Design a protein around this ligand. Structure first.
Ligand SMILES: Cc1cc2nc3c(=O)[nH]c(=O)nc-3n(C[C@H](O)[C@H](O)[C@H](O)COP(=O)(O)OP(=O)(O)OC[C@H]3O[C@@H](n4cnc5c(N)ncnc54)[C@H](O)[C@@H]3O)c2cc1C
Lengths: 666, 6, 133
């Protein structure tokens, strides 16, 4: 879309309808008359358009009203309510922009942000823009968290986030205009290469892939239409479901054969009954011919009875010869009907070992996309976020993704090498106890009005806990933490001195030997300016390959590449890097997935802030003190950068509303 | 999620 | 509404393949043994039929009696009358058979005879004795 309505789409909002969040802030309008609403919606959309058309400068209420028309610019308290609402929830003026009105003289309220991942940084920038005292505590020696970017010489490769998943509605599309991001499209095509090192034929390729998608759609049918979602009390995984589908597909292949051969024996048994009849007729024709012959040996003259006997036997024979000719007719029809059925048999097998191997690569792809064994994904919900995916080509940050968190970090109080150990929240406020990662006995205490926690789900999962909450987090929250899935996927960076692969092909697969190793080095990326190949380790294999040294991994890398490109066409890699996210103490995995027994609803539970008990018993209900942002908190955009980004924006708004008050609700 | 599928 | 075309997933079959731990492998083997059972039964009857076909070798060629294309006549020679009475005794009301035995009489002329000479050839007595067989 384009124009005013396109801005609403780009901002993930329906252009012609008021959202649930809008209904909360403008309950007068939404319950009011249809005319008012359309005015409101326009004002909203028009303001968004303005900010979007130029996101490198702050959009003020002045500048907004300036560029509005009649009758829309007549009511200025409406325009102000709109502008503020949008600015509060980071729909306008977010990221890196030049401020027209320099920051307020002095700050209001104090917020400690745990972790300087993208969600953290996003929220921090916002809160500071709202004029609050903000300090981030990063355990690492760098910003970005799960946005890691390897750099050496001219080699640049992302060990974490890498792909901008389409600009159509992406808040990152805004960010990319604010930051020097070199965005390059990824060409869809991905040729496969079997264990031998030779390409899968386009005949096979196209119609294994087809079967894959067909098998997926099948599981969806099991899930929704058949409601196959519980089995022995345990929730059904996607893996379980796929297995069941494949089995039912193998069963059908056999059922076809059985009823086909069963049709042959029913015709083969008709032929048997006919041949028996034909033999018994040739028996009696043999006998009757003899009798007629003997009757014709009686030379004339003969009396009438003896004359009749010759005539009789003649008739009786041509009668039986008539029948046999009609039976030889029937034999001719059934004899070709047997050659009919035996000519075109049904499918021999559902999939061969060679087929099933290529299909396992497609499962590995799915296991990569979810960063987890398909036996862990929720059947019903694994894809619950589908309706919200952005439009457009997927792109790669060619100059490295780190450029984004780094750029966001500018002008922020970030305490690097500071590992939070304990969060203490009470009715009167919060203290955060952290240590120095280097000399771990050196302690820090932080006092604040509110704590925003952007700790990765894998961290919140640790047992025994890496961070202690005082008081303990409520049962509903910890249940959500356990229920949810935190996955794992690793990357192998190979830096060569020369390009030896197809320069116009961005990615190519490798089909592994067994199901067990289907994710092991199953995919390779050529994206960057420099000659760098990037190899993915996914699924079950991801977890195990962490116990294996770099040399051994880089070995297996070259082994596969040699088999594909030539034993002497693959040189020794100048620089090599291997990720270990599950081992990394500040991640404990890669990103989240909807685990079996979980749902999208859990992601909402994660976002719900914690309100402490009262100090003095019988004193009023306190303020919410402990807030959560992060990739694992955003139901509609989990496991992404923009997801984290938006969660950050979200919490900042909620915190600001809480501590600076919402003026825009009159 | 499904978004990353190659 | 319905499974993607080519995929076969009935409510019943889902329950059957997920009845226990390896109810999946059980069902797939019952059919694997069924397939063997039927496939050897094919070759059994294919063998049985192959034998019955060799016993029909040559057809009925050395047993065919050449076509006697003769012109239908109106007069009843006393010979033809006697062939009739005998054909009646042997075939009953099968007018077609009788017509072939005599050869030069149409199926209707045979029926005609049955009424005209019914008087003199006691055709009632002749027919009731044919029934007694
Ligand atoms: C291999 C891989 C590839 C990916 N590719 C993509 C992609 O192509 N596209 C995409 O959109 N997304 C991708 N993602 C996901 C994306 O990187 C994350 O979802 C996002 O960065 C999460 O941001 P966050 O702020 O929620 O968490 P993080 O970025 O992890 O931030 C949390 C921060 O808290 C810090 N911390 C942890 N424990 C403590 C403690 N005790 N005290 C103080 N600080 C602490 C951590 O060091 C970290 O900096 C990928 C992820 C992985 C693992």
């Amino acid at each position: 879309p384009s124009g005013v309505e396109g801005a609403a789409f780009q901002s993930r909002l329906p252009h012609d309808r008021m959202t649930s969040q809008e209904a909360a802030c403008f309950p007068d309008i939404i319950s009011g008359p249809q005319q008012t609403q359309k005015v409101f919606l326009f004002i909203r959309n028009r303001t968004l358009q303005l900010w979007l058309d130029n996101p490198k400068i702050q959009l003020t209420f002045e500048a907004t009203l300036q560029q509005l028309e009649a009758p829309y610019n007549s009511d200025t308290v409406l325009v102000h309510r709109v502008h503020s609402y949008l600015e509060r929830h980071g729909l306008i003026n977010f990221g890196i922009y030049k401020r027209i009105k320099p920051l307020p003289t002095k700050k209001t309220g104090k917020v400690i942000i745990i972790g300087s991942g993208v969600s953290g940084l996003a929220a921090a920038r916002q809160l500071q823009s709202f004029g609050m005292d903000v300090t981030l505590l990063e355990a690492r020696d760098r910003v970005g968290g799960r946005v890691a970017t390897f750099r050496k010489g001219n080699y640049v490769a992302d060990l974490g986030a890498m792909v901008v998943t389409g600009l159509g509605g992406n808040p990152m599309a805004v960010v990319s205009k604010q930051v020097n991001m070199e965005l390059a499209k990824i060409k869809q095509k991905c040729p496969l290469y079997e264990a031998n090192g030779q390409a899968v034929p386009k005949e096979k390729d196209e119609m294994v892939e087809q079967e894959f998608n067909r098998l997926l759609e099948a599981t969806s049918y099991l899930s929704h239409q058949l409601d196959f979602n519980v089995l022995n009390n345990k929730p059904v995984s996607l893996g379980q479901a796929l297995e069941v589908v494949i089995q039912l597909q193998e069963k059908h292949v056999k059922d076809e054969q059985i009823e086909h051969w069963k049709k042959i024996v029913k015709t083969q048994e008709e032929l048997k009954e006919l041949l028996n009849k034909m033999v018994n007729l040739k028996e009696k024709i043999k006998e009757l011919h003899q009798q007629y012959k003997e009757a014709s040996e009686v030379k004339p003259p003969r009396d009438i009875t003896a004359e009749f006997l010759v005539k009789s036997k003649h008739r009786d024979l041509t009668a039986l010869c008539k029948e046999y000719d009609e039976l030889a007719e029937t034999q001719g029809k059934l004899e070709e009907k047997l050659q009919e059925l035996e000519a075109n048999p049904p499918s021999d097998v559902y999939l061969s070992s060679r087929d099933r191997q290529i299909l396992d690569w497609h499962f590995a792809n799915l296991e990569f996309a979810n960063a987890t064994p398909l036996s862990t994904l929720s059947l019903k919900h694994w894809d619950q976020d589908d309706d919200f995916e952005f439009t457009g080509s997927h792109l790669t940050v060619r100059n490295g993704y780190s450029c984004v968190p780094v750029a966001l970090a500018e002008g922020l109080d970030i305490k690097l090498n500071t590992a939070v150990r304990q969060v203490r929240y009470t009715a009167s406020g919060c203290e955060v106890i952290a240590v120095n990662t280097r000399s771990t006995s050196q302690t820090f205490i932080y006092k604040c009005d509110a704590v925003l926690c952007t700790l990765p789900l894998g961290v919140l999962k640790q047992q025994p806990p890496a961070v202690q909450f005082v008081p303990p987090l409520p049962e509903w929250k910890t249940s959500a933490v356990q229920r949810m899935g935190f996955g794992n996927l690793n990357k192998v960076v190979l830096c060569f001195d020369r390009v030896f692969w197809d320069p116009s092909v961005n990615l190519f697969g490798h089909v592994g030997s067994t199901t067990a190793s289907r994710g092991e080095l199953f995919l390779f990326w050529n994206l960057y300016k420099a000659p760098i190949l990037l190899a993915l380790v996914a699924g079950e294999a991801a977890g195990i390959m962490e116990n294996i040294s770099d040399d051994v991994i880089v070995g297996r890398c070259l082994a596969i590449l040699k088999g594909i490109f030539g034993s002497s066409a693959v040189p020794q890699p100048k620089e090599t890097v291997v990720s270990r996210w599950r081992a990394d103490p500040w991640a404990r995995g890669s990103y989240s997935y909807v685990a079996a027994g979980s749902s999208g609803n859990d992601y909402d539970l994660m976002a719900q802030p914690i309100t402490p008990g009262p100090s003095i018993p019988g004193a009023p209900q306190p303020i919410p003190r402990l807030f959560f942002a992060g990739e694992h908190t955003i139901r509609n955009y989990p496991a992404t950068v923009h997801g984290a980004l938006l969660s950050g924006l979200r919490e900042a708004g909620r915190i600001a509303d809480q501590f600076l008050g919402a003026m825009y609700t009159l | 999620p499904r978004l990353y599928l190659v | 509404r319905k499974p993607p075309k080519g995929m076969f997933l009935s409510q019943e079959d889902v329950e059957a393949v997920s009845a226990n731990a390896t109810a999946a492998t059980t069902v797939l083997r019952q059919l694997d043994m069924e397939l063997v059972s039927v496939k050897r039964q094919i070759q059994n009857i294919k063998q049985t039929n192959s034998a019955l076909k060799e016993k029909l070798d040559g057809g009925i060629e050395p047993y065919r009696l050449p076509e006697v294309i003769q012109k239908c006549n109106a007069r009843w020679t006393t010979e033809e009358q006697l062939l009739a009475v005998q054909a009646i005794r042997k075939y009953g009301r099968d007018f077609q058979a009788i017509s072939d035995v005599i050869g030069n009489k149409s199926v209707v002329q045979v029926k005609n005879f049955f009424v005209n000479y019914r008087r003199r050839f006691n055709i009632d007595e002749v027919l009731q004795e044919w029934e007694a067989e």
